[PDB]
Design an enzyme around this catalytic site. Structure first.
Site, PDB file in Angstrom:
ATOM      1  CG  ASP C 258      56.005 -36.580  90.074  1.00 58.22           C
ATOM      2  OD1 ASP C 258      56.293 -35.412  90.412  1.00 58.22           O
ATOM      3  OD2 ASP C 258      55.315 -37.341  90.783  1.00 58.22           O
ATOM      4  CE  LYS C 260      48.993 -29.444  91.421  1.00 58.46           C
ATOM      5  NZ  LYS C 260      47.733 -29.245  90.653  1.00 58.46           N
ATOM      6  NE  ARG C 280      41.217 -33.350  97.335  1.00 62.22           N
ATOM      7  CZ  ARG C 280      41.767 -32.682  98.341  1.00 62.22           C
ATOM      8  NH1 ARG C 280      42.821 -33.150  98.989  1.00 62.22           N
ATOM      9  NH2 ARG C 280      41.247 -31.513  98.705  1.00 62.22           N
ATOM     10  NE  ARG C 427      46.643 -26.647 100.254  1.00 62.74           N
ATOM     11  CZ  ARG C 427      46.678 -25.328 100.382  1.00 62.74           C
ATOM     12  NH1 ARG C 427      46.515 -24.743 101.558  1.00 62.74           N
ATOM     13  NH2 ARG C 427      46.880 -24.577  99.303  1.00 62.74           N
TER      14      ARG C 427
END
Ligand SMILES: [Mn+2]
Ligand SMILES: [Mn+2]
Lengths: 243, 251, 590, 243
Positions: C258, C260, C280, C427
């Site tokens: 999809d 980025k 963010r 992450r």
DNA sequence: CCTCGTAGTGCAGATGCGTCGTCGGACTGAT
DNA sequence: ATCAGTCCGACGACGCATCTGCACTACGAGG
């Protein structure tokens, strides 16, 4: 606790030495007068105001009054009156003080007592070496002039002159020696040599002009003090740490 | 070692401001025939010349022609405040630097000025010897009006003069500025010789003009067909200013 | 009730960096202390006064204002601390020597009464809260005043961290994620409940409210947790990999990709009739984006949902995206409605984690990737990123040619399977946020002469790890700076640089080198080094080719990197300004 | 076409008051009026100012209705160059709007006719409960000093009097406009309530030295109707959406 | 009207924040 | 002894706030 003050310029200028010096003060309306002494967070400068019952149209008190304020907010809520408009300060409950500006539109505001705490200040009881007297407009102009590029000013006067000198780029000085226009009064104990910095020590600008008779209290190894006298027995005394 | 007093301090402030708008360091050429200075730009487009004929000074005593180079990095601001239109300013050389004094008979607030500089070899007084056809006098709110008006709608200003008429056309085709100076408008006296047009630097036009506020006397303005413009005006207490701007003949 | 702890107990959290005792010591913070103070001390370990979604002013005391403030505190001038910190480099470990002359009476302590005391956590926090909000005409002398006064009431060890607290990130060796295991090993035993603490922390971005909730209740309070609208959930991230094929052998049949994009990834919100546009870094940017609130509440036929997406700037002529630098224009607060007509926008939505008042954090990427297809209908505005199911191995690179035209370069790989859900907080290897081969800079080899040096900043900033390079000009026989180099030297080279400069150290600038930048020391031009860069950029700081291209500006080399020294080349043999200009001319105009 | 007003500082001031609410507007010329209207991009404030047929000194019409749509910044900032007392004449034949001054210095400005507009004339016929009449020189003197103590106001009436009250933060401002006080001309009695912001009522005070009187039609849950009485029978309506 | 004093605005100069990530180097810990 | 994951942190360019200081001007008031 109802009080009425005829003038607003006194209430539009006295706080200029208070607006940016210490953000918190205790407006202390006494049982017989109004006196204001409040410390400062910098622990460097400190202003005082003395005002007896001579300029108030009406003054009824029963107990101590401690209307808190914000310096910026106090200036904001005292910027409406321009020419001569009087003021009407009173309330009934110690939670908000109704500040009514007399004249034009019937206008009163509600402001919270942002109560703060501070220590007490002794009644100086300190003597200095020189208590001079110059033209207040001229002396203010000198404070604004000798410190325009520099960031430090040195005060030095030997016998019959006063030099608030600022050096580092150019030694530009202004003197008031003998009765040439400056030095309207002078007491002497020793030769003088001291310094007083720039910036917020230049930010005593629009306070002196109420009375055109300045009176410094500079001395060796001693803090500064500006002496004044207005009409109705109103004297304002300044404080300032060395350099 | 000389001692010359200028009875108007604000006049001295105006002169130093007028000479400051071209550079950062200036000179004060002291000759036995007066007090004069000279400078020019790096691109040779605009310059200011200040001179003092030896007739208006209260006292004037100099032994030899002396010239000194000084900067107004600090002198401008330390002299930016002089709250007395009736203040006399005097300048006297010292052993090493430059010393200036100002006196005001209102508060006894005499201020001492020190400048770190020494004398240097003088330069002979030389002015561009040219004759300008169109000549006229005006106030201090006509040149400034033209400068401020043009400061927005362009940078290329052309001053067009007709037969006893003055036309302004500036900027580009998108935005222009239309005005006229009919006989006795914002002028006073006229000495037009030939109907001519020219151009200068609008931003530098305003830069030259902005160092002129305080001239209580009318300003005499002249130029020619692609001739460097003259902007002439003297203050109340003596001192003649001559401003040079060079015509930018196309870009 | 004392802030002296964050000096005494916190002095040992930078010399014992081992991840075996610093976590143990971080446990002692929440081991046994006050009730509400802990919820306030929590914000120390994130370099914030409070989470940045509640809405609060940012502290305005930066570096130079802090320089003036500390000068006031230590009764010194502006330039003394300036040079003393430039030489040292690591700003913050200056105050210990600054408060080495413990003698400051002034007023309020010399006439009738003398006293001195300390402070506590609830005092410092309150003062910071007040100093954040105070603003107006009386600002410069009032913001400085509180920092100076607290510094005058500080301690030598306090004035080791009080400076950095204003500066920003705590240089400790401990981050926010370690606080998550700190309480885990303090209150509820050890790491066994650490997963539960993290799970409770994930969906709500606060750190005081969550901590207080856990403190008042028990460990089981980490169970009944749902995403409540408003307070968002910390977004997840991944790494960049250069391996062309390391995903298929671990995932399904090439799944779907999809793309980025960039553009300040933001979490849309919607409660009742209100909507929030959190970004963010967890900051309210709803007001600065009034053109997207009408895109969501009027075109997303939902009721109460919290989603994730990116808000990329759009070209005013067609849709081809834009650099985030151009997107930065949408940070205005006053002329907001004017910039809208100039810079159009288009948002994209990737994640969809909450609807029907039921949680969706742990679900497969089939009811999450494609959930509200009848709700987010196609329009001339916000859409969902284009995704196509990859069939075979060779299809992992076929769509690259079409998707590179957009400008986002790399794409992501959606990994199917129960092991691959949208569990946020860490992450890592969750779903590949690849970048293909991305886009690198250019390479140009030149030789430059060392004419000066700069001391670095940080724990390793004591040495002179930064240098100023200059180029020889045969026309004027003068050296003009072309770039400033601070990285590219190995450990041995950096160590030898100090001795090499000291052997040729001079107090005054060499007459044949001129530069507008003032280095810490002046170095004789003796040695020549090779520096590689990306491109020549115009910079007013450097005097190379002054006024040749742009007035009051000069050419500069972008991205300086050291390569090797040139002992066989004299400074006169270095790159010349004429050659630099010729190289600049050959570069494309666009 | 030829346009001219008797006060170069007046028409330019009415239009400058549109430089804080409207970020764009369009001009058209009727048989006996000039329309300054358009819906703001803010989607809240509605502006529609009618120039009376009597504000000019020889207004002419050439063919028929013509649109003279403009760009805000130019016809706002180039016309910032106004002398103390001048005359402003406007000439715009087909493509160029030539703002020409006359008097002390015959000067002119130039600008192409930019074509962009948002012409939504919504119907305005909803009734209001309250009515008042105040002069143009007191409303501004109150609101400007009320324009700094927050950003949201509240209006409530009882016993046929208008109470301007400002709330927010922790301290409130009160104003007591009343017919008996003399700070009114005519009004009516209706007890209702509403709430309004400041930026939507403080940006419009700039049209002070351009009007003679002022009509305010306050209401309940309905748009605020501030009407600026114009010299020589003009319309000065300033619609404001509720909170 | 003259003059001055103060309010008021317009405008450069100086500090600070948000912004994309980017790469580093050290720690645990199971074979 | 050898590479996996794991983690704090340092990095230095851009465009916009936000305040500070100055420069110029408009107006109100006593003479
Ligand atoms: Mn910081
Ligand atoms: Mn932030």
């Amino acid at each position: 606790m109802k009080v009425v003050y005829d003038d607003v310029r006194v209430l539009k200028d006295i706080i200029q030495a208070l607006a940016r010096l210490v953000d918190e003060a205790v407006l202390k309306f006494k049982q017989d007068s109004v006196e204001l002494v409040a410390l400062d967070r910098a622990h460097i400068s400190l202003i005082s105001v003395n005002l007896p019952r001579e300029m108030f149209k009406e003054y009824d008190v029963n107990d101590e009054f401690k209307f808190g304020f914000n310096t910026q907010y106090l200036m904001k809520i005292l910027k409406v009156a321009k020419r001569k408009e009087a003021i009407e300060i009173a309330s009934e409950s110690p939670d908000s003080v109704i500040i009514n500006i007399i004249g034009s539109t019937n206008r009163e505001f509600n402001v919270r007592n942002l109560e703060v705490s501070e220590q007490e200040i002794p009644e100086i009881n300190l003597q200095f070496d020189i208590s001079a007297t110059i033209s207040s407009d001229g002396f203010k102009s000198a404070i604004s002039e000798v410190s325009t590029v520099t960031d430090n000013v040195v005060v030095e006067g030997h016998e019959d002159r006063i030099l608030i000198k600022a050096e580092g780029e150019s030694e530009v000085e202004v003197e008031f020696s003998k009765d040439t226009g400056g030095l309207q009064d002078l007491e002497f104990s020793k030769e003088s040599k001291n310094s007083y910095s720039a910036e917020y020590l230049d930010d005593v600008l629009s306070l002196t002009k109420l009375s055109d008779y300045v009176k410094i209290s500079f001395g060796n190894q001693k803090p500064l003090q500006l002496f004044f006298n207005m009409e109705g027995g109103g004297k304002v005394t300044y404080l300032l740490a060395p350099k | 070692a000389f001692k010359i007093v200028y009875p108007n301090a604000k006049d001295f402030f105006s002169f130093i401001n007028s000479i400051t708008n071209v550079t950062d360091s200036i000179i004060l050429n002291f000759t036995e025939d007066g007090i004069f200075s000279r400078h020019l730009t790096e691109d040779k487009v605009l310059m200011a010349i200040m001179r003092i004929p030896k007739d208006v000074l209260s006292e004037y005593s100099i032994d030899s022609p002396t010239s000194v180079k000084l900067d107004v990095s600090s002198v401008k601001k330390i002299l930016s405040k002089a709250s007395s239109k009736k203040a006399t300013i005097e300048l006297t050389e010292t052993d090493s630097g430059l010393k200036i004094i100002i006196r005001d008979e209102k508060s006894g607030a005499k201020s001492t000025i020190y400048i770190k500089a020494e004398k240097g070899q003088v330069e002979q007084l030389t002015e561009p010897k040219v004759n300008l056809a169109v000549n006229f006098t005006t106030d201090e709110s006509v040149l400034n009006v033209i400068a401020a008006d043009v400061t927005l709608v362009g940078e290329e200003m052309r001053i067009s003069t007709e037969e006893d008429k003055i036309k302004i056309e500036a900027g580009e085709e998108g935005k222009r500025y239309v005005a006229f100076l009919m006989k006795d408008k914002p002028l006073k006296e006229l000495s037009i010789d030939t109907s001519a047009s020219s151009s200068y630097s609008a931003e530098m036009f305003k830069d030259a003009v902005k160092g002129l506020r305080g001239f209580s006397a009318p300003t005499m303005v002249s130029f020619g067909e692609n001739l460097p413009m003259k902007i002439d005006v003297e203050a109340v207490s003596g001192g003649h200013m001559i401003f040079w701007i060079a015509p930018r003949l196309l870009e | 009730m004392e802030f002296k702890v964050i000096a005494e107990y916190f002095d040992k959290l930078e010399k014992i960096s081992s991840r075996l005792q610093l976590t143990a010591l971080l446990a002692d913070l929440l081991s046994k202390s006050d009730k509400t103070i802990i919820d306030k001390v929590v914000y120390i370990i994130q370099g914030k006064l409070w989470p940045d979604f509640l809405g609060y002013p940012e502290l305005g005391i930066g570096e130079k204002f802090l320089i003036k403030a500390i000068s006031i505190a230590t009764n010194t001038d502006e330039n003394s601390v300036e040079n003393l910190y430039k030489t040292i480099g690591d700003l913050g470990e200056v105050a210990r020597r600054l408060k080495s002359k413990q003698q400051s009476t002034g007023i309020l302590g010399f006439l009738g009464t003398t006293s001195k005391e300390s402070l506590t956590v609830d005092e410092v926090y309150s003062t910071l809260s007040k100093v954040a909000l105070t603003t107006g005409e009386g600002s410069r002398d009032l913001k400085i005043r509180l920092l100076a006064g607290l510094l005058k009431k500080a301690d030598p060890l306090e004035a080791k961290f009080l400076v950095r607290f204003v500066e920003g990130r705590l240089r400790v060796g401990i981050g926010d994620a370690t606080v998550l295991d700190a309480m885990a090993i303090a209150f509820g035993g050890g790491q066994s409940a650490s997963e539960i603490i993290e799970r409770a922390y994930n969906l709500r971005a606060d750190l005081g409210n969550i901590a207080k909730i856990i403190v008042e209740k028990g460990i089981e309070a980490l169970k009944t947790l749902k995403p409540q609208v408003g307070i968002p959930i910390r977004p997840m991230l991944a790494e960049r990999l250069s391996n062309p094929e390391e995903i298929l052998k671990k995932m399904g049949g090439n799944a779907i990709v999809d793309y980025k994009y960039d553009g300040e990834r933001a979490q849309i919100h919607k409660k009742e009739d209100k909507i929030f546009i959190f970004s963010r870094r967890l900051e309210n940017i709803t007001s600065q984006y009034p053109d997207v609130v009408d895109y969501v509440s009027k075109y997303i036929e939902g009721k109460e949902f919290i989603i994730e997406g990116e808000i990329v700037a759009i070209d005013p002529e067609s849709g081809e995206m834009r650099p985030f630098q151009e997107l930065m224009h949408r940070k205005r607060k006053s002329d907001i409605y004017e910039a809208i007509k100039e810079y159009p926008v288009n948002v994209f939505l990737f994640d969809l984690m909450y609807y029907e008042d039921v949680d969706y954090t742990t679900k497969p990427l089939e009811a999450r990737r494609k959930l509200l297809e009848s709700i987010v209908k196609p329009n001339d505005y916000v859409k969902i990123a284009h995704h196509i199911q990859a069939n075979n191995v060779e299809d992992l690179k076929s769509f690259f040619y079409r998707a590179i035209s957009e400008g986002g370069e790399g794409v992501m790989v959606k990994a199917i399977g129960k092991d691959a859900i949208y569990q946020a907080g860490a992450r890592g290897w969750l779903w590949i946020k690849l970048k293909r081969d991305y886009q690198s800079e250019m390479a140009d080899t030149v030789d430059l002469v060392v004419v000066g040096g700069f001391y670095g900043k940080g724990k390793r900033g004591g040495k002179i790890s930064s240098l100023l390079m200059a180029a020889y000009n045969p026309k004027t026989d003068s050296f003009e700076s072309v770039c400033k180099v601070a990285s590219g030297f190995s450990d041995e080279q950096l160590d030898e640089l100090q001795k090499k400069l000291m052997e040729i150290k001079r107090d005054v600038k060499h007459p044949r080198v001129n530069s507008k930048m003032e280095p810490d020391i002046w170095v004789e031009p003796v040695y020549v080094a090779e520096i590689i860069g990306s491109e020549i950029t115009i910079s007013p700081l450097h005097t190379c080719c002054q006024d040749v291209v742009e007035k009051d500006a000069g050419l500069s080399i972008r991205f300086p990197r050291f390569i090797r020294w040139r002992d066989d080349k004299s400074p006169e043999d270095a790159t010349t300004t004429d050659e630099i200009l010729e190289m600049y001319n050959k570069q494309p105009k666009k | 076409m030829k346009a001219k007003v008797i006060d170069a500082v007046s028409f330019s001031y009415i239009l400058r008051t549109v430089g804080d609410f409207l970020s764009e507007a369009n001009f058209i010329v009727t048989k006996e009026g000039i329309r300054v209207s358009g819906i703001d991009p803010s989607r809240v404030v509605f502006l529609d100012i009618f120039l009376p047929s009597s504000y000019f000194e020889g207004f002419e019409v050439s063919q028929e209705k013509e649109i003279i749509g403009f760009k805000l910044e130019d016809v706002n900032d180039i016309l910032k160059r106004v002398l103390k007392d001048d005359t402003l004449i406007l000439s715009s034949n087909e493509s160029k709007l030539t703002l020409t001054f006359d008097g002390e210095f015959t000067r002119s400005f130039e600008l192409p006719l930019i074509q962009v507009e948002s012409t939504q004339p919504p119907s305005v016929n909803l009734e209001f409960p309250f009515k008042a009449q105040l002069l143009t020189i007191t409303f501004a003197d109150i609101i400007d000093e009320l324009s700094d103590l927050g950003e949201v106001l509240n209006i409530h009436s009882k016993e046929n009097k208008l109470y301007f009250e400002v709330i927010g933060d922790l301290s409130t401002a009160k104003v007591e406009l009343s017919t008996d006080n003399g700070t009114l001309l005519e009004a009516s009695g209706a007890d209702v309530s509403s709430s309004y912001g400041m930026e939507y009522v403080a940006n419009t005070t700039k049209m002070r030295r351009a009007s003679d009187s002022m009509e305010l039609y306050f209401g309940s849950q309905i748009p605020l109707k501030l009407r600026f009485k114009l010299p020589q029978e003009g319309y000065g309506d300033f619609y404001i959406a509720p909170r």
